[PDB]
Amino acid sequence: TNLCPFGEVFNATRFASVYAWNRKRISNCVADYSVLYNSASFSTFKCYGVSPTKLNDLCFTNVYADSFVIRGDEVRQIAPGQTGKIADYNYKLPDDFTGCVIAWNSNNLDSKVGGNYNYLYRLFRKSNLKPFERDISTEIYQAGSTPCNGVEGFNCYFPLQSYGFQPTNGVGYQPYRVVVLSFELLHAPATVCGP
Amino acid sequence: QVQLVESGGGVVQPGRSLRLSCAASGFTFSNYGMHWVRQAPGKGLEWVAVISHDASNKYYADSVKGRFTISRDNSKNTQYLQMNSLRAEDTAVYYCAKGGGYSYVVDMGPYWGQGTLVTVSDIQMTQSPSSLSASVGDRVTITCRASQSISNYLNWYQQKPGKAPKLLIYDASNLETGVPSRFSGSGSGADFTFTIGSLQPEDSATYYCQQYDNLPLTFGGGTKVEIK
Amino acid sequence: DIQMTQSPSSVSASVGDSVTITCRASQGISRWLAWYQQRPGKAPKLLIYAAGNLETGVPSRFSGSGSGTDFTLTISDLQAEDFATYYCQQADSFPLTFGGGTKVDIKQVQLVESGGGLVQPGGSLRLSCAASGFTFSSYAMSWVRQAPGKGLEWVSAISGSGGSTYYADSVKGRFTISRDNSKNTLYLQMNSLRAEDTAVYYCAKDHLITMVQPEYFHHWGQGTLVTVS
Ligand SMILES: *[C@@H]1O[C@H](CO)[C@@H](O)[C@H](O)[C@H]1NC(C)=O
């Protein structure tokens, strides 16, 4: 009787940026989704494919968890068939997504008096991102026709922009923690059932 | 019932072209993607190339760049690898591995083929010691350093002679099914340690450590363990 | 303006006793605090970050608690190697402020610093911080100095790209900080030295990837002594 270590990922002290989201693999344990579904502490709980109404009696081969931090206005962009800065340049989901996402407000931890500038996002890219693709490059973007030559100047901008978080900001400009769960199903023994 | 087989092996003179084929079964091949790994006789492992789930992003190694081409055909559950201008240092055993679904090209696990023999007639990981000897019931400790921070993105392999590598420890000391509790590990950041308890005669093999933090996959030097 | 008051100033105990230390703040700092210990003749070592997050190498015998304004630190069993000086600092507003310190009595990455020396008052000096084994441009670097008989004091910091500069109130207009990404080195150019500028200067770094703000200090250097007379 091994319990799935969900405490290490949901109750983690430090989270990752949206452009560098962390991925964790969970296997060979027993998971109780009823406790998570009855926490009354998550602002948003909406997902497609599987019904959250007590469907923990299913066996899956593996479970993958993705974590990142965004603001309130960009929470809607984390959904299949969505467009925006995040959906195109930072995190893209397939149209046939099979999983669930959990988001809650964390203004009491991630905010900082005077401004917290350690959270960044990508604003310039040559083309849209494919689903489940991670880009961590820091190459100087060429906006016009004059090559940047590795230096910043006219029509040469850094591809990353830093979030500005303050405790006095509005609800639409407050940090939010997002957790994404994915279920894999193959011709495998599928030891992850969680009765 | 996931199986992988190799085809197309042979002997060719330098300056010609050869093509290999790998067939997959037991899963949806259409939206996962595969890897290519080779191992020279008497040397370590080396990552070659990877393809996406829709044949839109292809990546190669520095030593095979410009001469190797990877192709996909989502109609027969087969994979193609085109080799041009083969040289003397291309004599190695080639394995086709299973990757991560969609555009996750940094996923790789316990899914290896039997391998084929072809003969022609960044982050740096250091592993120490290069060799080790012990008695029947000694304790074995292996260290695998890293060139930078890779977080918890390290796993360990075991390879018996004449056989494909076997995964024992994955994702920073998480045990895998069908593995005894004797094997264990610890570490995070840039320092990792692999530990073996009360040794047994059937533990004589070579162990490797490899990282999957970024696209260029790199392996460890290796350590041979024999009973004294 | 955000100075932290630390009590008690000193405490004496035997082996097996329990010692508690309180660190207050002028205003709420949420969960931005750290604890350090410094043995005589050695650089400070981090023990607890955030509020109660134990370090991997520190034994589970050290515990911390508190949030907002009141913070406490407790040692379960006192041993012969637990006698040192402890400090508390905040990392949410600039400039960063350290604690007074508490005295307890018996009852991969490499950093090299050079450039210290004796100079006439009113002169100038330049210090260099050398870093290797990691990505220099992915972290923010800070300069910290300690008086020969006083506590720590935060001097200045530099951003990971070089576009942001932070200076203390007692060094503005006379000090300058810069970095060279190509050579993987950090610079500290200072002018108009006074007799009150004699201290051992340290080079600090954070374990986590921080690009704009230094926050905590996980790695410390060896230090250079500068004497003005
Ligand atoms: C996280 O911690 C809180 C309080 O410590 C607890 O109520 C919650 O169940 C924890 N999360 C998980 C997934 O156990």
XYZ file of C-alpha atoms and ligand atoms in Angstrom:
666
model
C 0.000 0.000 0.000
C 2.074 2.894 -1.358
C 0.427 6.318 -1.480
C 1.106 8.539 -4.476
C 3.396 11.459 -3.462
C 1.020 14.272 -4.391
C 2.184 16.358 -1.425
C 5.578 16.964 -3.029
C 4.051 18.601 -6.127
C 0.983 20.474 -4.839
C 2.633 21.643 -1.599
C 5.979 22.484 -3.214
C 7.635 25.611 -1.841
C 8.919 26.963 -5.174
C 7.288 26.816 -8.608
C 8.688 27.193 -12.117
C 8.153 29.835 -14.779
C 5.618 29.437 -17.577
C 8.328 29.135 -20.242
C 10.234 26.559 -18.156
C 7.407 24.451 -16.725
C 8.473 21.430 -14.677
C 7.257 17.926 -15.539
C 7.018 15.025 -13.083
C 6.203 11.352 -13.659
C 4.107 9.464 -11.092
C 3.890 5.670 -11.170
C 3.602 2.575 -8.966
C 1.399 3.977 -6.204
C -2.221 4.394 -5.091
C -3.978 7.708 -5.744
C -7.121 9.042 -4.043
C -8.569 11.815 -6.207
C -11.571 12.278 -3.893
C -9.477 14.267 -1.399
C -8.259 16.589 -4.159
C -11.788 16.976 -5.554
C -13.074 17.888 -2.070
C -10.499 20.439 -0.890
C -12.595 23.616 -1.381
C -9.405 25.615 -1.962
C -9.032 25.733 -5.771
C -10.541 28.697 -7.608
C -10.821 26.899 -10.968
C -11.503 23.207 -11.629
C -12.597 22.447 -15.203
C -11.351 19.668 -17.478
C -12.356 17.548 -20.473
C -12.338 13.841 -21.300
C -12.938 12.269 -17.890
C -15.760 13.145 -15.512
C -14.414 14.368 -12.138
C -17.580 13.092 -10.404
C -16.016 10.062 -8.693
C -14.164 8.385 -11.570
C -11.131 7.203 -9.583
C -11.909 3.513 -10.246
C -9.906 3.574 -13.505
C -6.385 2.240 -14.030
C -3.819 4.265 -15.979
C -0.274 3.413 -17.024
C 1.356 6.692 -15.959
C 0.481 10.156 -14.639
C 2.355 13.342 -15.586
C 2.137 16.633 -13.663
C 3.031 20.051 -15.101
C 3.420 23.167 -12.942
C 3.865 26.852 -13.794
C 2.777 30.309 -12.617
C 0.713 32.811 -14.625
C -1.648 35.701 -13.859
C -5.422 35.777 -13.570
C -6.247 37.062 -17.048
C -4.231 34.294 -18.747
C -5.886 31.381 -16.906
C -8.513 31.089 -19.655
C -5.796 30.552 -22.287
C -4.922 27.157 -20.728
C -7.512 25.204 -22.718
C -7.752 23.304 -26.029
C -8.387 25.494 -29.057
C -7.272 28.750 -27.431
C -5.255 31.669 -28.790
C -3.090 34.244 -27.065
C 0.456 34.988 -25.988
C 0.718 31.992 -23.652
C -1.075 29.509 -25.919
C 1.117 30.441 -28.897
C 4.538 31.099 -27.344
C 4.732 29.414 -23.908
C 2.360 26.453 -23.429
C 0.196 24.714 -26.042
C -2.304 21.900 -25.466
C -3.517 19.390 -28.072
C -7.114 19.488 -29.254
C -7.560 15.877 -28.041
C -6.324 16.556 -24.503
C -7.100 13.815 -21.970
C -6.422 15.146 -18.490
C -7.380 17.725 -15.899
C -6.039 21.083 -14.719
C -6.114 22.708 -11.265
C -5.586 26.423 -10.597
C -5.742 28.485 -7.400
C -4.792 31.973 -6.257
C -1.433 32.430 -4.516
C -1.257 36.188 -3.934
C -0.201 35.673 -0.302
C 3.063 33.926 -1.285
C 4.240 34.988 -4.761
C 3.561 38.709 -4.273
C 6.341 40.978 -3.036
C 6.303 44.547 -1.733
C 7.893 46.760 -4.383
C 7.535 44.264 -7.226
C 8.476 40.628 -7.881
C 10.304 40.465 -11.218
C 11.599 36.869 -11.084
C 8.683 35.500 -13.155
C 9.176 35.819 -16.918
C 7.337 34.896 -20.111
C 8.231 34.782 -23.800
C 6.749 37.585 -25.910
C 8.487 37.312 -29.315
C 8.802 34.189 -31.454
C 9.085 33.407 -35.152
C 6.226 30.879 -35.200
C 3.606 29.290 -32.972
C 4.495 26.445 -30.620
C 3.346 22.881 -31.173
C 1.515 21.096 -28.331
C 3.700 19.851 -25.463
C 6.747 21.758 -26.736
C 9.247 23.520 -24.469
C 11.520 26.330 -25.672
C 14.181 27.755 -23.356
C 16.302 29.574 -25.930
C 17.414 33.166 -25.334
C 18.448 34.153 -28.863
C 18.057 37.829 -29.746
C 14.964 38.370 -31.884
C 15.322 40.157 -35.230
C 12.262 42.347 -35.806
C 13.277 44.195 -38.976
C 15.760 43.577 -41.787
C 19.032 44.658 -40.133
C 20.706 41.665 -38.430
C 21.084 41.984 -34.668
C 24.624 40.509 -34.729
C 24.243 39.385 -31.116
C 23.588 42.880 -29.728
C 20.377 44.654 -28.728
C 19.259 47.842 -30.449
C 16.740 49.088 -32.995
C 14.413 46.246 -34.051
C 16.341 43.920 -31.703
C 14.517 42.969 -28.497
C 15.070 40.402 -25.765
C 12.512 37.581 -26.200
C 11.570 37.418 -22.489
C 9.448 39.839 -20.458
C 9.171 39.904 -16.666
C 5.896 39.905 -14.740
C 5.245 42.739 -12.310
C 3.552 41.441 -9.157
C 2.507 43.688 -6.265
C 0.179 43.030 -3.308
C -1.937 46.072 -4.260
C -2.597 44.858 -7.816
C -6.051 43.866 -8.994
C -7.446 40.362 -9.295
C -6.562 40.293 -12.996
C -2.891 41.025 -12.242
C -2.367 38.593 -9.354
C -0.215 35.440 -9.550
C -1.907 32.060 -9.988
C -0.473 28.551 -9.658
C -1.514 26.045 -12.336
C -1.147 22.251 -12.190
C -1.890 20.046 -15.215
C -2.404 16.273 -15.008
C -2.072 13.898 -17.973
C -3.066 10.223 -18.131
C -1.335 7.705 -20.401
C -2.923 4.442 -21.579
C -0.931 1.747 -23.407
C -0.800 -2.059 -23.579
C 0.870 -2.206 -20.179
C 0.138 -3.829 -16.803
C -1.013 -0.359 -15.625
C 0.007 -0.677 -11.985
C -1.362 2.826 -11.225
C -5.002 2.201 -10.292
C -5.561 3.878 -6.924
C -8.574 1.986 -5.522
C 3.312 -6.497 -25.492
C 5.443 -3.599 -26.737
C 8.155 -4.909 -29.067
C 10.722 -3.244 -31.320
C 12.714 -4.952 -34.084
C 15.585 -3.833 -36.318
C 16.210 -4.428 -40.011
C 18.570 -3.301 -42.753
C 21.892 -4.279 -41.198
C 24.806 -5.293 -43.358
C 28.355 -4.573 -44.484
C 29.139 -1.749 -46.921
C 32.349 -0.195 -48.200
C 33.111 3.453 -47.339
C 31.508 5.982 -49.655
C 28.131 4.247 -50.072
C 24.654 4.540 -48.547
C 22.679 2.257 -46.238
C 19.155 2.371 -44.811
C 17.766 0.876 -41.598
C 14.201 0.120 -40.544
C 12.496 -0.255 -37.160
C 8.991 -1.634 -36.600
C 6.877 -0.842 -33.539
C 3.911 -2.691 -32.060
C 1.715 -2.643 -28.973
C 0.994 1.102 -28.898
C -0.157 4.044 -31.009
C 2.939 4.796 -33.087
C 1.230 7.626 -34.988
C 1.622 10.328 -32.309
C 4.610 9.349 -30.151
C 7.919 9.530 -32.008
C 11.106 7.495 -31.706
C 14.823 7.911 -31.014
C 17.999 6.424 -32.482
C 20.925 5.218 -30.361
C 24.167 3.496 -31.347
C 26.969 1.843 -29.374
C 30.384 1.029 -30.812
C 31.929 -2.333 -29.824
C 33.841 -1.750 -26.597
C 32.628 1.852 -26.197
C 29.708 3.588 -24.504
C 26.316 4.764 -25.699
C 25.655 7.738 -27.966
C 22.434 9.468 -29.009
C 22.022 9.931 -32.771
C 18.728 11.553 -33.795
C 15.076 12.053 -32.869
C 11.854 12.787 -34.758
C 8.573 14.372 -33.683
C 5.048 12.927 -33.885
C 4.209 14.670 -37.182
C 7.598 14.775 -38.989
C 7.845 18.546 -38.542
C 10.844 18.876 -36.179
C 13.994 16.804 -36.700
C 17.222 16.959 -34.702
C 20.587 15.270 -35.214
C 23.934 14.935 -33.471
C 27.050 16.914 -34.363
C 28.938 13.851 -35.645
C 26.118 12.774 -37.999
C 24.914 16.223 -39.056
C 24.549 16.766 -42.797
C 24.812 13.090 -43.791
C 21.988 11.344 -41.890
C 18.280 11.753 -42.618
C 15.303 10.477 -40.608
C 11.906 9.815 -42.182
C 8.456 8.881 -40.903
C 5.531 6.958 -42.414
C 2.379 6.874 -40.285
C 0.816 4.124 -42.408
C 2.877 0.968 -41.720
C 4.164 1.505 -38.139
C 7.748 1.727 -39.408
C 10.691 4.103 -39.022
C 13.375 4.955 -41.579
C 16.961 6.159 -41.187
C 19.026 7.170 -44.223
C 22.824 7.035 -43.935
C 25.146 8.603 -46.512
C 28.944 8.638 -46.848
C 29.698 6.011 -44.218
C 33.171 6.064 -42.663
C 35.288 3.657 -40.629
C 34.070 4.977 -37.256
C 30.443 4.087 -38.102
C 30.805 0.444 -36.997
C 28.305 0.207 -34.137
C 25.154 -1.560 -32.959
C 22.051 0.544 -33.614
C 18.968 0.578 -31.379
C 15.590 2.216 -31.989
C 13.930 3.505 -28.819
C 10.511 4.876 -27.894
C 10.197 8.562 -27.044
C 7.577 10.803 -25.468
C 4.227 11.563 -27.039
C 3.533 14.720 -29.068
C 6.466 17.197 -29.160
C 8.205 16.011 -25.966
C 11.495 14.933 -27.530
C 13.379 14.605 -24.215
C 11.548 11.501 -22.938
C 13.221 8.088 -23.074
C 12.657 4.967 -21.005
C 12.731 1.157 -20.809
C 11.788 0.423 -24.437
C 14.694 -0.902 -26.513
C 15.039 -3.133 -29.548
C 17.345 -6.088 -30.036
C 19.758 -4.061 -32.167
C 21.439 -4.568 -35.534
C 25.126 -4.732 -36.457
C 26.490 -2.489 -39.223
C 30.194 -2.703 -40.076
C 32.226 -0.672 -42.578
C 35.226 -2.388 -44.187
C 26.256 20.966 -24.115
C 26.090 19.143 -20.772
C 28.999 16.832 -19.923
C 28.507 13.981 -17.446
C 31.429 12.345 -15.630
C 31.117 8.989 -13.858
C 33.628 7.575 -11.378
C 35.164 5.150 -10.771
C 35.866 3.638 -14.198
C 36.172 0.174 -12.623
C 35.381 -1.462 -9.300
C 35.989 -4.776 -7.549
C 34.310 -6.205 -4.463
C 33.787 -9.402 -2.488
C 30.598 -11.450 -2.090
C 29.009 -9.102 0.435
C 30.664 -5.703 0.020
C 28.973 -2.342 -0.632
C 29.134 -0.508 -3.966
C 28.915 3.270 -4.376
C 28.982 5.061 -7.742
C 29.195 8.822 -8.307
C 27.889 10.635 -11.400
C 28.698 14.353 -11.538
C 27.177 16.903 -13.916
C 28.409 19.979 -15.762
C 25.472 22.130 -14.594
C 22.107 22.017 -12.840
C 19.762 19.461 -14.409
C 17.325 19.221 -11.459
C 15.859 15.703 -10.973
C 16.415 14.548 -14.557
C 18.826 11.639 -14.087
C 18.317 7.887 -14.440
C 20.537 4.808 -14.230
C 20.923 1.878 -16.623
C 22.218 -1.687 -16.406
C 23.637 -3.606 -19.367
C 24.661 -7.257 -19.412
C 27.088 -8.372 -22.142
C 25.392 -8.978 -25.473
C 22.102 -7.469 -24.282
C 20.249 -4.171 -24.456
C 20.449 -1.748 -21.509
C 17.920 -2.186 -18.706
C 16.453 0.653 -16.646
C 16.718 0.264 -12.862
C 16.511 3.753 -11.307
C 14.555 6.598 -12.911
C 13.729 10.207 -12.014
C 16.199 10.797 -9.157
C 16.047 7.533 -7.199
C 12.525 6.277 -7.908
C 12.307 2.494 -8.064
C 10.814 0.696 -11.061
C 8.569 -2.361 -11.123
C 10.290 -5.739 -11.062
C 13.404 -4.412 -9.303
C 14.702 -5.600 -5.907
C 14.914 -3.161 -3.011
C 18.702 -3.635 -2.896
C 19.296 -0.997 -5.579
C 18.907 2.586 -4.379
C 20.131 6.095 -5.087
C 20.084 9.683 -3.872
C 21.055 13.179 -4.932
C 19.792 16.346 -6.603
C 21.163 19.370 -8.409
C 24.608 18.424 -9.702
C 25.621 15.553 -7.366
C 24.152 12.055 -7.643
C 24.974 8.720 -6.027
C 24.071 5.118 -6.875
C 24.276 2.588 -4.042
C 24.181 -1.219 -3.966
C 23.551 -3.133 -0.753
C 24.531 -6.718 0.044
C 26.125 -7.772 -3.239
C 25.023 -10.882 -5.141
C 26.784 -12.906 -7.862
C 24.201 -11.842 -10.473
C 25.112 -8.141 -10.112
C 28.137 -8.238 -12.452
C 27.370 -5.786 -15.276
C 28.077 -2.229 -16.452
C 26.091 0.763 -15.189
C 25.497 4.093 -16.934
C 24.027 7.452 -15.939
C 22.429 9.770 -18.496
C 20.519 13.051 -18.343
C 17.471 14.302 -20.245
C 17.311 17.942 -19.147
C 17.910 19.337 -22.651
C 17.702 18.080 -26.247
C 21.332 16.836 -26.555
C 21.279 13.533 -24.689
C 24.545 12.499 -23.040
C 25.535 9.319 -21.207
C 28.104 8.443 -18.563
C 31.474 6.760 -18.820
C 30.374 3.472 -17.292
C 31.616 1.260 -14.468
C 32.420 -2.455 -14.645
C 31.670 -4.548 -11.547
C 33.190 -8.014 -11.134
C 33.331 -10.459 -8.234
C 36.766 -10.748 -6.630
C 13.200 51.427 7.331
C 12.781 47.642 7.365
C 15.461 46.897 9.959
C 15.078 43.641 11.894
C 15.468 43.422 15.675
C 17.022 40.196 16.977
C 16.712 39.021 20.585
C 18.411 37.874 22.701
C 21.874 39.307 22.035
C 23.555 36.390 23.832
C 22.635 33.165 25.609
C 24.523 30.486 27.542
C 23.494 26.840 27.810
C 24.891 23.366 28.414
C 24.713 20.172 26.349
C 21.126 19.052 25.798
C 19.417 22.395 26.429
C 16.875 24.116 24.178
C 17.579 27.617 22.847
C 15.009 29.852 21.143
C 15.799 32.963 19.091
C 13.302 35.648 18.065
C 13.669 37.900 15.016
C 11.181 40.748 14.583
C 10.447 43.043 11.648
C 9.144 46.586 11.286
C 6.515 45.493 8.744
C 5.105 42.255 7.376
C 7.518 40.332 5.152
C 5.217 37.380 4.337
C 7.558 34.376 4.051
C 10.805 36.076 2.943
C 13.395 35.248 5.600
C 16.564 33.200 5.999
C 18.774 31.911 8.807
C 22.568 31.658 8.796
C 25.299 30.397 11.110
C 28.920 31.561 11.143
C 31.697 29.785 13.014
C 34.752 31.842 14.049
C 37.029 32.182 11.043
C 34.627 30.786 8.432
C 32.055 32.094 5.979
C 28.366 32.029 6.966
C 26.352 28.927 6.104
C 22.640 28.921 5.310
C 20.462 26.787 7.587
C 16.773 27.613 6.998
C 15.278 29.456 4.027
C 11.730 30.696 3.445
C 10.212 30.095 6.870
C 10.555 26.411 7.765
C 12.238 24.796 4.755
C 15.138 22.725 6.060
C 18.264 22.459 3.934
C 19.209 19.070 2.508
C 22.501 18.857 4.408
C 21.390 20.463 7.677
C 20.178 17.892 10.245
C 16.483 17.781 11.184
C 17.380 18.980 14.704
C 17.063 22.640 13.614
C 13.508 23.941 13.212
C 11.975 27.277 12.292
C 8.516 28.787 12.499
C 6.684 32.087 12.233
C 5.056 34.252 9.573
C 4.501 37.920 8.804
C 6.200 39.696 11.711
C 7.230 37.235 14.442
C 9.714 34.476 13.600
C 11.378 31.930 15.873
C 14.217 29.421 15.623
C 14.656 26.444 17.948
C 17.475 23.953 18.543
C 16.449 20.625 20.062
C 19.733 19.247 21.452
C 22.762 21.496 21.929
C 26.114 19.912 21.046
C 29.722 21.101 20.980
C 29.498 21.939 17.254
C 26.347 24.072 17.654
C 28.103 27.068 19.261
C 28.215 29.879 16.689
C 26.513 33.155 15.741
C 23.094 33.215 14.069
C 21.594 35.930 11.863
C 18.244 36.649 10.219
C 17.652 38.651 7.048
C 14.771 39.722 4.812
C 14.683 39.434 1.022
C 11.502 41.191 -0.127
C 12.435 44.901 -0.205
C 15.552 46.813 -1.188
C 18.003 47.456 0.302
C 18.368 44.066 1.989
C 18.823 44.177 5.765
C 20.547 41.681 8.059
C 20.049 40.973 11.756
C 22.046 41.993 14.795
C 23.121 38.464 15.658
C 22.894 36.086 18.610
C 25.835 34.474 20.414
C 25.601 30.998 21.961
C 28.269 30.058 24.512
C 29.097 27.048 26.678
C 27.647 27.263 30.189
C 30.421 22.376 -8.292
C 30.427 26.171 -7.997
C 33.695 27.867 -7.040
C 34.145 31.541 -6.155
C 37.521 33.287 -5.847
C 38.025 36.882 -4.695
C 41.129 39.043 -5.038
C 42.086 42.707 -5.029
C 42.164 43.559 -1.334
C 45.006 45.648 0.024
C 46.029 48.636 2.097
C 45.432 52.059 0.535
C 45.728 55.651 1.692
C 42.458 57.347 2.723
C 40.812 59.047 -0.230
C 42.219 56.493 -2.684
C 40.551 53.833 -4.799
C 40.502 50.068 -5.255
C 39.016 47.451 -7.568
C 37.771 43.986 -6.624
C 37.036 40.998 -8.856
C 34.741 38.011 -8.298
C 35.520 34.897 -10.353
C 32.826 32.289 -11.007
C 32.947 28.924 -12.759
C 31.010 25.681 -13.036
C 27.625 27.198 -13.922
C 25.848 29.614 -16.251
C 27.052 33.058 -15.178
C 24.312 34.978 -17.013
C 21.461 33.000 -15.392
C 22.090 34.254 -11.838
C 22.241 37.570 -9.992
C 25.352 38.427 -7.983
C 25.678 40.526 -4.830
C 28.473 42.048 -2.748
C 28.396 41.632 1.041
C 30.914 42.999 3.546
C 31.456 42.320 7.248
C 33.233 44.590 9.712
C 36.119 43.121 11.750
C 34.007 43.133 14.921
C 30.451 43.791 13.728
C 27.796 41.869 11.807
C 27.083 41.485 8.114
C 26.153 44.370 5.820
C 24.715 44.237 2.294
C 26.511 46.565 -0.120
C 25.226 46.163 -3.678
C 23.921 43.714 -6.268
C 23.871 43.247 -10.039
C 21.284 41.771 -12.388
C 21.806 38.666 -14.499
C 21.899 40.717 -17.709
C 23.479 43.921 -16.379
C 20.605 46.349 -16.951
C 19.603 46.675 -13.292
C 21.772 48.065 -10.490
C 21.095 48.203 -6.746
C 23.096 50.195 -4.194
C 22.956 50.753 -0.449
C 22.248 54.132 1.130
C 25.806 54.519 2.487
C 27.584 53.720 -0.809
C 25.508 55.600 -3.403
C 27.547 58.015 -5.503
C 30.927 56.442 -4.676
C 30.688 52.732 -5.613
C 30.139 51.034 -8.963
C 29.297 47.429 -9.860
C 29.638 45.753 -13.255
C 29.996 42.294 -14.773
C 31.617 40.763 -17.856
C 29.709 37.814 -19.308
C 32.443 36.873 -21.796
C 35.152 36.565 -19.122
C 32.746 35.218 -16.448
C 33.818 37.759 -13.834
C 32.280 40.413 -11.589
C 33.667 43.880 -10.862
C 33.449 46.186 -7.838
C 35.020 49.598 -8.518
C 34.952 51.993 -5.555
C 36.340 55.494 -4.987
C 36.890 57.945 -2.121
C 37.626 55.373 0.571
C 37.158 56.396 4.209
C 38.421 54.971 7.492
C 35.005 53.343 8.088
C 35.234 51.244 4.896
C 37.583 48.618 6.376
C 35.800 45.271 6.084
C 36.047 41.794 4.572
C 34.081 41.660 1.316
C 32.236 38.520 0.217
C 30.718 37.404 -3.085
C 27.335 35.687 -2.824
C 25.029 33.727 -5.116
C 21.630 32.026 -5.006
C 21.035 28.351 -5.752
C 17.786 28.890 -7.658
C 17.791 30.549 -11.075
C 17.163 34.246 -10.335
C 17.514 36.739 -13.179
C 16.476 40.131 -11.764
C 16.648 39.847 -7.968
C 19.225 38.123 -5.728
C 16.858 37.055 -2.919
C 18.747 34.530 -0.779
C 22.453 33.631 -0.683
C 23.293 29.922 -0.917
C 26.937 30.103 -2.068
C 29.656 32.273 -0.523
C 33.259 33.039 -1.427
C 36.442 33.267 0.621
C 36.709 37.030 1.155
C 39.301 39.799 0.821
C 40.407 42.143 3.605
C 40.741 45.859 2.817
C 42.525 48.113 5.317
C 42.402 51.922 5.202
C 44.883 53.886 7.312
C -0.986 20.335 1.313
O -0.918 20.800 2.667
C -2.198 21.120 3.230
C -1.939 21.687 4.607
O -0.667 21.292 5.101
C -3.079 19.874 3.253
O -4.369 20.221 3.745
C -3.198 19.287 1.853
O -3.909 18.056 1.901
C -1.814 19.052 1.252
N -1.927 18.569 -0.115
C -1.939 17.271 -0.434
C -2.064 16.954 -1.894
O -1.853 16.392 0.418
